[PDB]
Design an enzyme around this catalytic site. Structure first.
Site, PDB file in Angstrom:
ATOM      1  N   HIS A  13       0.805  -1.215   0.000  1.00  0.00           N
ATOM      2  CA  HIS A  13       0.000   0.000   0.000  1.00  0.00           C
ATOM      3  C   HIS A  13       0.847   1.277   0.000  1.00  0.00           C
ATOM      4  O   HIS A  13       1.908   1.340   0.616  1.00  0.00           O
ATOM      5  CB  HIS A  13      -1.014   0.002   1.178  1.00  0.00           C
ATOM      6  CG  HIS A  13      -0.410  -0.002   2.573  1.00  0.00           C
ATOM      7  ND1 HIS A  13      -1.174   0.058   3.724  1.00  0.00           N
ATOM      8  CD2 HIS A  13       0.877  -0.048   2.996  1.00  0.00           C
ATOM      9  CE1 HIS A  13      -0.380   0.050   4.779  1.00  0.00           C
ATOM     10  NE2 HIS A  13       0.867  -0.014   4.364  1.00  0.00           N
ATOM     11  N   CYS A  67       3.105   8.372   5.323  1.00  0.00           N
ATOM     12  CA  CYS A  67       3.074   7.645   6.577  1.00  0.00           C
ATOM     13  C   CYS A  67       4.386   6.911   6.821  1.00  0.00           C
ATOM     14  O   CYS A  67       5.195   6.740   5.907  1.00  0.00           O
ATOM     15  CB  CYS A  67       1.916   6.658   6.568  1.00  0.00           C
ATOM     16  SG  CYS A  67       1.863   5.611   5.094  1.00  0.00           S
ATOM     17  N   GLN A  85      -8.807  -1.490   7.282  1.00  0.00           N
ATOM     18  CA  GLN A  85     -10.054  -0.731   7.324  1.00  0.00           C
ATOM     19  C   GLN A  85     -11.076  -1.331   6.361  1.00  0.00           C
ATOM     20  O   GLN A  85     -10.709  -2.065   5.446  1.00  0.00           O
ATOM     21  CB  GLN A  85      -9.791   0.734   6.965  1.00  0.00           C
ATOM     22  CG  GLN A  85      -8.949   1.487   7.986  1.00  0.00           C
ATOM     23  CD  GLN A  85      -9.592   1.522   9.360  1.00  0.00           C
ATOM     24  OE1 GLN A  85     -10.380   2.415   9.665  1.00  0.00           O
ATOM     25  NE2 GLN A  85      -9.254   0.561  10.197  1.00  0.00           N
ATOM     26  N   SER A 108      -7.531   9.635   6.282  1.00  0.00           N
ATOM     27  CA  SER A 108      -6.104   9.769   6.528  1.00  0.00           C
ATOM     28  C   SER A 108      -5.305   9.924   5.221  1.00  0.00           C
ATOM     29  O   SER A 108      -4.070   9.994   5.244  1.00  0.00           O
ATOM     30  CB  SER A 108      -5.597   8.568   7.320  1.00  0.00           C
ATOM     31  OG  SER A 108      -6.320   8.419   8.533  1.00  0.00           O
ATOM     32  N   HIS A 111      -5.066   5.805  -0.363  1.00  0.00           N
ATOM     33  CA  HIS A 111      -4.245   4.600  -0.338  1.00  0.00           C
ATOM     34  C   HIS A 111      -4.276   3.906  -1.684  1.00  0.00           C
ATOM     35  O   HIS A 111      -5.338   3.737  -2.271  1.00  0.00           O
ATOM     36  CB  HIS A 111      -4.740   3.604   0.729  1.00  0.00           C
ATOM     37  CG  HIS A 111      -4.765   4.127   2.131  1.00  0.00           C
ATOM     38  ND1 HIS A 111      -3.939   3.660   3.128  1.00  0.00           N
ATOM     39  CD2 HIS A 111      -5.556   5.048   2.709  1.00  0.00           C
ATOM     40  CE1 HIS A 111      -4.227   4.272   4.258  1.00  0.00           C
ATOM     41  NE2 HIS A 111      -5.205   5.120   4.031  1.00  0.00           N
TER      42      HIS A 111
END
Length: 117
Positions: A13, A67, A85, A108, A111
């Site tokens: 990811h 991230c 998720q 967030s 992705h």
């Protein structure tokens, strides 16, 4: 006599964040001021390279993901459903070897999910 979606899959990811978030912070830059449209451009830019085979996803995820997952290579090996998720799970467990979900929009950030195995 079939299983509802795979039990465990391996997917890498990539995560591109944007200004609209509860935390616009990256490891390569302090304040993420790029808006959603800018993120889209970035995402689509990689999505094309991934299909054409220009750059490797591992290299991309380890550099363009805002991230800390970037330092984790972007790959999590074979993971179960209760580790991701809801939107991520739906996409990841729907990708066969060679398939790529594309832009998975979450709060967030966006992705990119690619089935590596």
């Amino acid at each position: 006599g079939s299983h509802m979606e795979p039990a465990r899959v391996r997917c890498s990811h990539l995560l591109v964040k944007h200004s609209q978030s509860r935390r616009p912070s990256s490891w390569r830059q302090e304040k993420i001021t790029r808006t959603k449209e800018e993120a889209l451009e970035l995402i689509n830019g990689y999505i094309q390279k991934i299909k054409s085979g220009e750059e490797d996803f591992e290299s991309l995820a380890s550099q363009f993901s805002d991230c800390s997952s970037a330092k984790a290579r972007g790959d999590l090996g074979a993971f179960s459903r209760g580790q991701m998720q809801k939107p991520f799970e739906d996409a990841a467990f729907a990708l066969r070897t060679g398939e790529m979900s594309g832009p998975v929009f979450t709060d967030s950030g966006i992705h990119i999910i690619l089935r590596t195995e």
